[PDB]
């Protein structure tokens, strides 16, 4: 009665992995904006998950429901070699993304991989070539085979596939395959998050707060706006809005501008917002008393409301000068500014309180992409690390958790092959790709 119910759970686990990882590979193989260096490595781990969901998870489920091996000692040594290669290739791929992301975030390109799509393929090929050698050669050469009679009675028998390891293999293949890339991946991807938050500037802070639209839209207050919070005019005539745009750009825009055109406007509004402070005798001494992070928070207020508007905060600016952040915070929040834009004022005042980009944490579109790659890496660890800890622990002492726990923790690790396609649903580029393939 247990077996029937157990099989149906595993049958759905298999299909969830296969159809999930098919949809991921299918999207990158067809969609143009999805063909990127970082999404090429994502194809390498979705591949490992599909090979896992087709050649590993189905054979593993059978070995449990029938409690025996009905596929011979050849497919037993090949099945385990594929499994080990999938697990080794997945973390090394994640550690490669982690490293690639460190080099992309430190480089002046900030969110662009330095490797070309030709180098990226070689990196994936060298991952699958080398990880296939550390997985298939110590298994087909039988460097994994243990010396105890209980293990050799399972090595001679065709109805057994309990992967028995000697004390040496069990420690080496756990260290090189999982522990070494995990230590590097986490240490290096703690730095990709660290470098993104520290290199956050006023231009990203305002792209977060004012957004980006390349066509004239109505502001929060109700005046014609374009690009990144660039007020075209307060006039309620579209002809009076499309006139100011054609003059500010210097071409027949017809109510639409480019990313380059909008960026040129935004670099001019930010420079004027800084200028507007240095010319205003009220804001200028407060601009001196504020640090690099809090200076961007004042520029953020002057950019939105204006040099005159912000000078109106006579009590706040004073408490900001005296380094009394929290005393300024309460006064800045009991403002009509806070009530008009609560979401943005919550972020501006927190940056004033903390003096850190703690308010703009994973807010930029490029940063939610780092959080996504950060969840895939972290979730992997949540699934595989309990199996590996118990794996490396039972090399020291054999007799504690035995077979019943080892298989469960292995299946926590197996279920991780089907979770990555559900975490790609966070990315709008994949969200749009998935709904197109599934016809929704
Ligand atoms: C079952 C075992 C022995 C077979 C291993 C499967 C091999 C053929 C697959 C799985 C992962 C695959 C890679 C996944 C990622 C990419 C990105 C793609 O845009 C170009 C090809 C490339 C670089 C693939 C090459 C072939 C590859 C290495
Ligand atoms: C199984 C491996 C086959 C999948 C190949 C693939 O993912 O193709 C991507 C394409 O080359 C993108 O440019
Ligand atoms: C399901 C929960 C997955 C946990 C992933 C994780 O640990 O998160 C990484 C990082 O905090 C992302 O910003
Ligand atoms: C049912 C068996 C075949 N599957 C166990 C793990 O999924 C594979 O885990 C590993 C991945 C990479 C290297 C490894 N070395 C090991 C030594 C003992 C057990 C698992 C592993 C292992």
From Swiss-Prot:
Topology versus the membrane: Multi-pass membrane protein
Regions of this protein lying in the Extracellular compartment: 66-76, 145-166, 397-403
Compartments (UniProt record): Cell membrane; Early endosome; Golgi apparatus
Binding site for (S)-carazolol: 83, 173, 410
Segments in the Cytoplasmic topological domain: 29-41, 100-120
TM region positions: 5-28, 42-65, 77-99, 121-144, 167-190, 373-396, 404-427
Protein name from the UniProt record: Beta-2 adrenergic receptor
Organism: Homo sapiens (Human)
């Amino acid at each position: 009665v247990w077996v029937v119910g157990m099989g149906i759970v595993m049958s759905l686990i298999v299909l969830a992995i296969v159809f999930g990882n098919v949809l991921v590979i299918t999207a990158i193989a067809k969609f143009e904006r999805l063909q990127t260096v970082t999404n090429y490595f994502i194809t390498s781990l979705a591949c490992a998950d599909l090979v896992m969901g087709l050649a590993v998870v189905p054979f593993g489920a059978a070995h449990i429901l029938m409690k025996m091996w009905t596929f011979g000692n050849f497919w037993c040594e090949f099945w385990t070699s594929i499994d080990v290669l999938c697990v080794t290739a997945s973390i090394w791929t994640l550690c490669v993304i982690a490293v690639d992301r460190y080099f992309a975030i430190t480089s002046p390109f900030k969110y662009q991989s330095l490797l070309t799509k030709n180098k990226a393929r070689v990196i994936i090929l060298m991952v699958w070539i080398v990880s296939g050698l550390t997985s298939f050669l110590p298994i087909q050469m039988h460097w994994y085979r243990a010396t105890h009679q209980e293990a050799i009675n399972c090595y001679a028998e065709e109805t057994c596939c309990d992967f028995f390891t000697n004390q040496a293999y069990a420690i080496a293949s756990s260290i090189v395959s999982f522990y070494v890339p995990l230590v590097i991946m986490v240490f290096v991807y703690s730095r990709v998050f660290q470098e993104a938050k520290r290199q956050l500037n006023i231009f990203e802070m305002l792209r977060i707060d004012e957004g980006l639209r390349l066509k004239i839209y109505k502001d929060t207050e109700g005046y014609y706006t374009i690009g990144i919070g660039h007020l075209l005019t307060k006039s309620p005539s579209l002809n009076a809005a499309k006139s100011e745009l054609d003059k500010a750009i210097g071409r027949n825009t017809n109510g639409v501008i480019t990313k380059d055109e909008a960026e040129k406007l935004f670099n001019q509004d930010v420079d004027a917002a800084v200028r507007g402070i240095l010319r205003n005798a009220k804001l200028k001494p407060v601009y001196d008393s504020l640090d690099a992070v809090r200076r961007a928070a004042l520029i953020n207020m002057v950019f939105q409301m204006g040099e005159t508007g912000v000078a109106g905060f006579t009590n706040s600016l004073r408490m900001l000068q005296q380094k009394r952040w929290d005393e300024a915070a309460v006064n800045l929040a009991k403002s009509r500014w806070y009530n008009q834009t609560p979401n943005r004022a919550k972020r501006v005042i927190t940056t004033f309180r903390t003096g850190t980009w703690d308010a703009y944490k994973f807010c930029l579109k490029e940063h939610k992409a780092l959080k996504t790659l950060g969840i895939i890496m972290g979730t992997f660890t949540l699934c595989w690390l309990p199996f590996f800890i118990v794996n490396i622990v039972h090399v020291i002492q054999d007799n504690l958790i035995r077979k019943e726990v080892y298989i469960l923790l292995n299946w926590i690790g197996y279920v991780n092959s089907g979770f990555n396609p559900l975490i790609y649903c966070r990315s709008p580029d994949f969200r749009i790709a998935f709904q197109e393939l599934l016809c929704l």
